[PDB]
Amino acid sequence: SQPSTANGGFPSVVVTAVTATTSISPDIESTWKGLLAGESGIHALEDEFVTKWDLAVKIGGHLKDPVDSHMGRLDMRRMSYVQRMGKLLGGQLWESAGSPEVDPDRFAVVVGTGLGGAERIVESYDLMNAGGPRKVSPLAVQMIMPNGAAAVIGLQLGARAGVMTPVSACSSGSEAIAHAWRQIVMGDADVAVCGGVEGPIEALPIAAFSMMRAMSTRNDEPERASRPFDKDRDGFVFGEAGALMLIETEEHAKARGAKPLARLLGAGITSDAFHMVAPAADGVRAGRAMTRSLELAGLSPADIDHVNAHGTATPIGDAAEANAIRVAGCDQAAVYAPKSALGHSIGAVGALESVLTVLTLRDGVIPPTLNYETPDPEIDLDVVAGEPRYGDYRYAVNNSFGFGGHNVALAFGRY
Amino acid sequence: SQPSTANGGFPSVVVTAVTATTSISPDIESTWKGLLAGESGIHALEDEFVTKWDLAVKIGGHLKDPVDSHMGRLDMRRMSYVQRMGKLLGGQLWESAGSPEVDPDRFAVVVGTGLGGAERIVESYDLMNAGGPRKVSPLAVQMIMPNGAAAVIGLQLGARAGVMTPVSACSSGSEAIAHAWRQIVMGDADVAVCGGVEGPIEALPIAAFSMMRAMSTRNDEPERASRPFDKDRDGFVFGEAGALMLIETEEHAKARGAKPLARLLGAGITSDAFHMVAPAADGVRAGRAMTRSLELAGLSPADIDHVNAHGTATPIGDAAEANAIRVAGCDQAAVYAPKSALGHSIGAVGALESVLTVLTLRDGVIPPTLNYETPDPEIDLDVVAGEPRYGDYRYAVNNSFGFGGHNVALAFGRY
Ligand code: NA
Ligand code: NA
């Protein structure tokens, strides 16, 4: 037979530490407690660009604790925003892991981003227009390339078994975890830091996605705007995030006394090849990503107790994902849509949601999907709502189905 | 034992078609004939930005046949440059492959880029400054994200087993081929289109890399400027490119009557974790990427007849790579540095050089490394020079060691 995690064909891989900054909290355990309490990170946008442009969208979730409140002048001048977020989270994660001394040559970093690794280019032009090519800093190259955040974390932590950056829009953070798992199971690494980072809420992303009719404009009730799978959903809401996890072989964790939080069992990556932004309505390739993760894990659909949905709250997105979940045989799973409370953070969100899936398995509880008040007949999923559902969750799939038809599914198990 | 291509642990994977556009020609076979004839694609830059800024660097290789000479108004308004290059090359490759009808669900696309997938953001701002958020096109989102080129090719050709975009600066195109090989050998796909694309030579990249002292300023003799491994080298020269190859299982090629050009045997990805732009002087992690490709291939260093060097012509870059080649045990290999003739094209160059490595194995010939006139005692490599070297090349490694310490080595075999 082909290798699987269950049959021992792949080494056992465990999640041993997690970190995230969100619109609810800089502390992942406090984010988690808040989600369980029904808290939302989504508020009225107070930014002056809203009134300047009279934007249709006037809501979103800025980080509770801004990254740059932790950043000095040097970091502010010599790193992009996503590089600063990466440095911050990388250091926080390493400290949560008990600052372990690992073999640099068996240590990988894989960190996705979505849009915002395209920040520092304009400023370079400006320097050049005023004073010419010699007024462009010799530091420009290290700030402008889209792999900058992963590069910073790899250099910070000393990762010499590969430093990688996948870009697949919304699924970038999940895809990063996927590739880190592959790096380990193929024998290239024993430990990896992986996840995703993304820039802050800004005017142009709001305008670009608003003009696709992708975004909620329920401005009078910000905390009620994001309604994944609900009959009355009207698009997504931006909520800032960055998230990283530490994964390693079970043997590597045991050798250093690390307590695993969960198992990372398999990962499926597929594509729709359907449309440049819209998901395929039939959910067939998305569902196949789910199935692929199960194959690699050595699980059957009936094993899947829980799906952490991509669940953006767009009309067409949630409908496609319901079809996907059915195609994969997982439509009896308990479903959570964290974007209901945390909003959408393109390249970071899949990583954040992967962290949340780990916590669900660890604690045996799924927070309520906020705003889920009227089930949609065309969805027909068991969506957790009202208050947290405590349950015997043994296995879970985290879905991330990004703009462009990039489908990533990650299979996790309780440790 | 652990799986290898030689021991049958991984399926046999073959290269069945190739395409590229370069500073020498739009036709890869004509590029190849030109390289063998000692031709250089590097000339005086005639662009007005040179004189406007009085740039220190006044040389480079624009594509012989500009992409946009093949592009109509619709494509010009609705795709970024790298997306247009991708569409062009994707279609050319598919036609060279005999336009095969493959199973979409076993067909992957992996396409890297370096910088230039960050083109269309400024124009979106401008539209918004003048007429507001509703003047930003609903097409903006599909043009601004760094995965846009891979997305276009996947949609064009119908690839539903994953559409991926690695970013690792100079090694992006090689890394893409690496991940495509993994996608196949792990069982996720049977066929993949892979490689890299990059934008055109522009003022800001020139200024940014010039200010690092990374670039040659031998403006009076443009064709003589790029001197990899030569004692008198003074940095790299930009030469535009994009390149794609079609790879598939040997069984898949045989079933459809495709004639393989070469075997893709293994791929190693490591990282220096040393510095944000400079390579580690000791070449140890770079060499390890080479070694890893051999392990996966099931080859020993003594099997390696040929190394297609990363060879940028920077003082510190070439020195580090010589150390790498020694560390990997491949310092008896015949070495070629195509950047001598084709220049450096960040995200595309590794893919282009992977194509060149395939042709070397197919034809049993290595073109001369241009400008290699005075060996450097600290390099001590067998560098092909003067005229093509005809040889019994059975196995070859293509090196791509990008800014940030991203090391990719690909192991190829003669078919
Ligand atoms: Na999810
Ligand atoms: Na090379």
The whole-angstrom separation of Cα A330 and Cα A396 is: 10
Which residues of A, range 277-336, sit inside 8 Å of B by Cβ?
A: 277, 285, 288, 292
Task: Record the resolution, in angstroms.
Answer: 2.0
Spatial neighbors of A95 by CB under 8 A, at least 6 apart, are: none
Q: Which helix H or strand E contains B196, and what residues bound it? A: strand B191-197
Contact (CB, 8 A) for A381 and A325: yes
Which residues from B are below 8 Å from A125, CB to CB? 204
CA angle A101, A105, A109 (to 5 degrees): 80
Positive or negative CA dihedral for B67, B73, B75, B81? Answer: positive
B134 vs A161, A186, A211: nearest CB: A211
Give the right CATH number for B1-265 from 2.40.160.20, 3.40.47.10, 3.60.21.10, 3.40.50.2000. 3.40.47.10
Q: Is A275 annotated as a binding residue?
A: no
Determine how β-strand B107-113 pairs with β-strand B43-44.
Answer: unpaired
- Residues of B catalogued as catalytic: 170, 310, 344
**Exposed, middle or buried, A381 (CB in 10 Å: 0-12/13-18/19+)?**
buried
Of all residues in chain B, the one with the smallest CA distance to A146 is: B167
A194 flagged as catalytic:
no
Q: Which of A69, A63, A66, A65 lies closest to A42, judged by CA?
A: A63
Alpha helices, H only, A81-238: 81-96, 121-131, 140-144, 148-157, 172-185, 203-210
| Active site (annotated) includes residue A310 | yes
Q: Quote the tokens at residue B158.
A: 């119908």
Q: State whether residue A204 sits within 8 Å of chain B by CB.
A: yes
CB within 8 Å: B2 and A188: no
C-alpha A66/C-alpha B350 separation (Å) is 38
* CB of A8 less than 8 A from some CB of B: no
Q: Which residues of B touch A182 (CB under 8 A)?
A: 182, 186
Whole-number Å distance between alpha carbons of A274 and A285? 10
**B positions 125-154 inside 8 Å of A (CB):** 125, 128, 132-134, 136-138, 140-142, 144-147, 151-152, 154
Cα of B350 from ligand 1 centre, angstroms: 34
Instruction: Tell whether the torsion through CA atoms of A326, A330, A332 and A334 is positive or negative.
Output: negative
- Provide DSSP, B278-325: SPPTT-HHHHHHHHHHHHHHT--GGG--EEE------HHHHHHHHHHH
Two tokens, residue B108: 């992957």
Could you check whether B1-265 and B266-415 share the same CATH topology?
yes
Q: Tell me if chain B has a CB within 8 Å of the CB of A96.
A: no
Which of B346, B61, B367, B389 lies closest to B176 in space, CA to CA? Answer: B346
Cα–Cα distance, B210 to B267 (Å, whole number): 32
Give the distance, in angstroms, between the CA of residue A36 and the centroid of all CA atoms in the same chain: 19
Rounded distance between C-alpha atoms, residue A405 and residue A283, angstroms: 10
Query: Which uninterrupted H or E stretch holds B126?
Result: helix B121-131
Rounded Cα distance, B337 and B322, in Å: 12
Distance between CA A347 and CA A357 in Å, rounded?
Answer: 17
Tell me which of A122, A137, A163 to substitute to probe the interface with B (most B C-beta atoms closer than 10 Å).
A163
> How many Å separate Cα B347 from the centre of its chain?
6
Structure tokens at B176: 């893409």
Comparing CB atoms, the residue among A137, A208, A292 nearest residue B140 is A208
The domain locations on chain B are 1-265, 266-415
Could you give the 3-state DSSP secondary structure of residue A115? Answer: coil
Q: What is the C-alpha R_g of chain A?
A: 20
Q: Is B208 on the interface with A (CB under 8 A)?
A: yes
Interior CA angle at A41 toward A35 and A42, to 5°? 135
Secondary structure (3-state) at A281:
coil
Cα–Cα distances in angstroms (integers) from residue A387 to residues A36, A108, A127, A183, A395, in the given order? 7, 38, 53, 38, 21
Q: Which two tokens stand for residue A89?
A: 């989270």
Q: Decide if A65 contacts A23 (C-beta within 8 A).
A: no
Under 8 Å between Cβ of B202 and B346: no
What is the rounded CA–CA span in Å between residue A117 and residue A140?
13
For B263, residues 6+ apart whose C-beta sits below 8 A from its C-beta are B5, B12, B13, B14, B15, B412, B413, B414, B415
A308 and A17 Cβ atoms separated by less than 8 Å: no
Angle between helices A121-131 and B203-210 (to 10 degrees): 80
User: Phi/psi at A301 (nearest 5 deg)?
Assistant: -50, -35
Closest CA to A400 of A279, A245, A300: A279
Query: B340 near B313, Cβ under 8 Å?
Result: yes
B266-415: CATH number: 3.40.47.10
Residues of B in contact with A121 (CB under 8 A): 118, 121, 204
Residue A126 CA to ligand 2 center (angstroms) comes to: 35
> What is the Cα–Cα distance from A251 to A253, expressed in whole angstroms?
5
